[PDB]
Design a protein around this motif. Structure first.
Motif, PDB file in Angstrom:
ATOM      1  N   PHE A 292       0.852  -1.211   0.000  1.00 28.58           N
ATOM      2  CA  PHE A 292       0.000   0.000   0.000  1.00 28.58           C
ATOM      3  C   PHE A 292       0.889   1.263   0.000  1.00 28.58           C
ATOM      4  O   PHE A 292       0.706   2.202  -0.761  1.00 28.58           O
ATOM      5  CB  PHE A 292      -0.965  -0.004   1.211  1.00 28.58           C
TER       6      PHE A 292
ATOM      7  N   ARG B 112      -5.606   3.107   3.584  1.00 28.79           N
ATOM      8  CA  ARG B 112      -6.550   2.202   2.892  1.00 28.79           C
ATOM      9  C   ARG B 112      -7.950   2.447   3.501  1.00 28.79           C
ATOM     10  O   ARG B 112      -8.126   2.463   4.719  1.00 28.79           O
ATOM     11  CB  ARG B 112      -6.038   0.754   3.047  1.00 28.79           C
ATOM     12  N   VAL B 113      -8.924   2.743   2.638  1.00 27.65           N
ATOM     13  CA  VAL B 113     -10.270   3.072   3.012  1.00 27.65           C
ATOM     14  C   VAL B 113     -11.367   2.071   2.530  1.00 27.65           C
ATOM     15  O   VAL B 113     -12.539   2.212   2.888  1.00 27.65           O
ATOM     16  CB  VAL B 113     -10.616   4.444   2.461  1.00 27.65           C
TER      17      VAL B 113
ATOM     18  N   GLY C 221     -11.899  -2.088   0.166  1.00 26.55           N
ATOM     19  CA  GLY C 221     -11.486  -3.010  -0.876  1.00 26.55           C
ATOM     20  C   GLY C 221     -12.643  -3.889  -1.181  1.00 26.55           C
ATOM     21  O   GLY C 221     -13.589  -3.979  -0.385  1.00 26.55           O
ATOM     22  N   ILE C 222     -12.511  -4.610  -2.258  1.00 24.34           N
ATOM     23  CA  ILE C 222     -13.527  -5.492  -2.696  1.00 24.34           C
ATOM     24  C   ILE C 222     -12.886  -6.553  -3.594  1.00 24.34           C
ATOM     25  O   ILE C 222     -11.856  -6.318  -4.250  1.00 24.34           O
ATOM     26  CB  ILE C 222     -14.611  -4.674  -3.413  1.00 24.34           C
TER      27      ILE C 222
ATOM     28  N   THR D 238     -18.293   2.626  -8.258  1.00 22.35           N
ATOM     29  CA  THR D 238     -19.176   2.958  -7.171  1.00 22.35           C
ATOM     30  C   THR D 238     -18.484   3.106  -5.839  1.00 22.35           C
ATOM     31  O   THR D 238     -18.732   4.029  -5.075  1.00 22.35           O
ATOM     32  CB  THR D 238     -20.361   1.960  -7.115  1.00 22.35           C
ATOM     33  N   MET D 239     -17.664   2.127  -5.472  1.00 21.56           N
ATOM     34  CA  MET D 239     -16.909   2.201  -4.266  1.00 21.56           C
ATOM     35  C   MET D 239     -15.965   3.436  -4.298  1.00 21.56           C
ATOM     36  O   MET D 239     -15.889   4.168  -3.277  1.00 21.56           O
ATOM     37  CB  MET D 239     -16.161   0.845  -4.028  1.00 21.56           C
TER      38      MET D 239
ATOM     39  N   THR E 265     -17.789   6.667  -3.792  1.00 26.42           N
ATOM     40  CA  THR E 265     -18.313   6.771  -2.480  1.00 26.42           C
ATOM     41  C   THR E 265     -17.250   7.252  -1.525  1.00 26.42           C
ATOM     42  O   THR E 265     -17.492   8.110  -0.658  1.00 26.42           O
ATOM     43  CB  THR E 265     -18.934   5.431  -2.025  1.00 26.42           C
ATOM     44  N   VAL E 266     -16.093   6.574  -1.537  1.00 22.16           N
ATOM     45  CA  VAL E 266     -15.037   7.029  -0.667  1.00 22.16           C
ATOM     46  C   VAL E 266     -14.480   8.406  -1.054  1.00 22.16           C
ATOM     47  O   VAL E 266     -14.035   9.097  -0.164  1.00 22.16           O
ATOM     48  CB  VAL E 266     -13.936   6.010  -0.456  1.00 22.16           C
TER      49      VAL E 266
ATOM     50  N   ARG F  98     -16.271  10.938  -2.062  1.00 19.55           N
ATOM     51  CA  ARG F  98     -17.220  11.756  -1.297  1.00 19.55           C
ATOM     52  C   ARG F  98     -16.938  11.787   0.178  1.00 19.55           C
ATOM     53  O   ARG F  98     -16.904  12.849   0.801  1.00 19.55           O
ATOM     54  CB  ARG F  98     -18.677  11.304  -1.580  1.00 19.55           C
ATOM     55  N   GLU F  99     -16.638  10.636   0.782  1.00 17.99           N
ATOM     56  CA  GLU F  99     -16.446  10.585   2.139  1.00 17.99           C
ATOM     57  C   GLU F  99     -15.192  11.380   2.500  1.00 17.99           C
ATOM     58  O   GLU F  99     -15.182  11.969   3.538  1.00 17.99           O
ATOM     59  CB  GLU F  99     -16.275   9.100   2.548  1.00 17.99           C
ATOM     60  N   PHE F 100     -14.101  11.294   1.713  1.00 16.46           N
ATOM     61  CA  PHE F 100     -12.829  11.917   2.109  1.00 16.46           C
ATOM     62  C   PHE F 100     -12.668  13.256   1.393  1.00 16.46           C
ATOM     63  O   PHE F 100     -11.580  13.793   1.295  1.00 16.46           O
ATOM     64  CB  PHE F 100     -11.681  10.936   1.910  1.00 16.46           C
TER      65      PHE F 100
END
Ligand code: ADP
Ligand code: ADP
Ligand code: C0D
Ligand code: C0D
Lengths: 266, 266
Positions: free
Chosen positions: A71, A113-114, A116-117, A206-207, A210-211, A213-215
């Motif tokens: 990372f 790291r915020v 994973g999928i 999508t993920m 989303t993150v 937006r969050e950060f």
């Protein structure tokens, strides 16, 4: 020469540096024994390793090697490549779409790291095989480019029909959600493969949004070998990122971010 | 008698109310003509509709109906059910896992949509069909319940060959990413279907726990018909929600949240 290696679950990425000259090499994780052999024959000033298979290389070579967490290494190489290629981004999500997908928030100075999928290139290859019996990656991805998702995927407008939907009608509502409506269909290997890339791209994006937006960042940088020889994936991800108000970036040699990074954490 | 109908992409959920007391019924969206036939013969005091196919109902019945927007109806009805079932949650994410998946943050007063994704029930049926040639829903979901994902999915510990991973080794790294390492033998329908259910669950949960972090809630309420006859799906979702430090909730007749909410919206 100085050598950095990012030995992942599927691909081994090797960067050799001498003077300001770089060599970008990719090898199969299946062939890791040949990489170790090659290394054992070279004159190496500095060897830096990262990736899930870094240990395998380290235990079989005849020289010491520094080992870095992937990372940090990816974040370090990516910043180097962004700068070189004229992207001066204040902050960004980066999505590393490898065998699997790992998401990171780079705050201008360092990464966290915020999420994973498991949707990524390993899924493209595996699910792609179950659905086409193709094992050859070039073969699989080339075929996917010839596919149409329309009899496989369900859109918002198919669900809301002739009424006003609550989100835009052309968005995918249900991946593979039109299949039961087209059982008259045959479902071509190309169309099936395009839908697998479609779902992987949509979920990653999508993920990532989303993150983002969050950060509180509008920038999303996508790296990983999964984009190689896969213009459909690049396109799915790019279009949807733009649609949700973010800026996507790809980077020349982005798949080697970790290999480069390893060299410059030393 | 008062009737609330949530007419979605796959199923039509019907709530009938009389002496304050409710009856629940579902019909396939493909048999919508039969729902219309049933409504046209009934004397109905109050008919309220929501969902994608509410239009199709409303344009084919010979009585009036009031139409409500699904996101609001679902929120209203889920709040009613939660209290009836003894929950007092101050705030929560709700994930409505239907044909596709829609995610909402409920702040104690109203809902906001905070994302969505095309991985949900429609994908389980369509991708499930493609891998198994089963179209019968209870048959497809029962087939998956005792499947083994081990030859199909790749875990973090598989990539980190003997070295310590930087995240939990038992996490799925790549859905379907073990398939190419298990080409020797057959991939059975049960095992493939358990893998389908696993990728849908993990994607839905990943999104739900991401937005829970973003909006600062540890509560995640999961609704939709996709959980019916799918204990494995419930388990994939519940286990990973709990591992991410959140609290998962399932609701009796949760799939009728929109139908109930349509009756109580003003
Ligand atoms: N020559 C190739 N052979 C196999 N896969 C490839 C190749 N080129 C690109 N890919 C894609 O890249 C993915 C791996 O990406 P990469 O970023 O190297 O991941 P990792 O570090 O996990 O090995 C594969 O899963 C596949 O989707
Ligand atoms: N009897 C059934 N027939 C078909 N699908 C079912 C049935 N029971 C549950 N399901 C699952 O529920 C999903 C739809 O959930 P629901 O919340 O009703 O969605 P929508 O409002 O989009 O119809 C289906 O895609 C399927 O996975
Ligand atoms: C059980 C649900 C787990 C889905 C979440 N999985 C993950 O975060 C791991 C996804 N994979 C990745 O990050 C990469 O493939 C690495 C190499 C494991 C970092
Ligand atoms: C182009 C990729 C778009 C993926 C995002 N798609 C969505 O948010 C639609 C997901 N689906 C839903 O939210 C539900 O199925 C409805 C019924 C469409 C509300």
């Amino acid at each position: 020469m100085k050598v950095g290696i990012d030995a992942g679950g599927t691909l081994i990425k090797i960067v050799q540096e001498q003077d300001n000259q770089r060599t970008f090499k990719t090898e199969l994780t299946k062939n890791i024994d040949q990489v170790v052999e090659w290394l054992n024959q070279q004159q190496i000033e500095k060897l830096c390793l990262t990736g899930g298979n870094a240990g395998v290389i380290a235990e079989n070579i005849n020289i010491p090697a520094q080992i870095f967490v992937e990372f940090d290494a990816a974040s370090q190489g990516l910043g180097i490549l962004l700068k070189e290629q004229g992207h001066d981004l204040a902050d960004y999500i980066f999505a590393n779409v490898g065998t699997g997908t790992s998401l990171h928030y780079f705050d201008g100075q360092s990464q966290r790291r915020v999420g994973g999928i498991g949707t990524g290139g390993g899924m493209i290859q595996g699910l792609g095989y179950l659905l086409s019996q193709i094992t050859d990656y070039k073969q699989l991805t080339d075929m996917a480019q010839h596919g149409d998702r329309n009899t496989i995927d369900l859109k918002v407008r198919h669900i809301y029909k002739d009424t006003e939907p609550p989100i835009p009608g052309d968005l995918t509502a249900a991946n593979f959600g039109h299949v039961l409506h087209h059982l008259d269909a045959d479902f071509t290997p190309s169309n099936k493969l395009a839908a697998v890339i479609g779902v992987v791209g949509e979920v990653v994006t999508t993920m990532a949004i989303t993150v983002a937006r969050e950060f509180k960042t509008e920038n999303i940088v996508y790296i990983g070998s999964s984009f190689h020889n896969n213009a459909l994936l690049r396109k799915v991800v790019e279009d949807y990122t733009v649609l949700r108000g973010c800026k996507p970036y790809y980077v020349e040699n982005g798949a080697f971010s970790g290999a480069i990074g390893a060299l410059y954490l030393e």
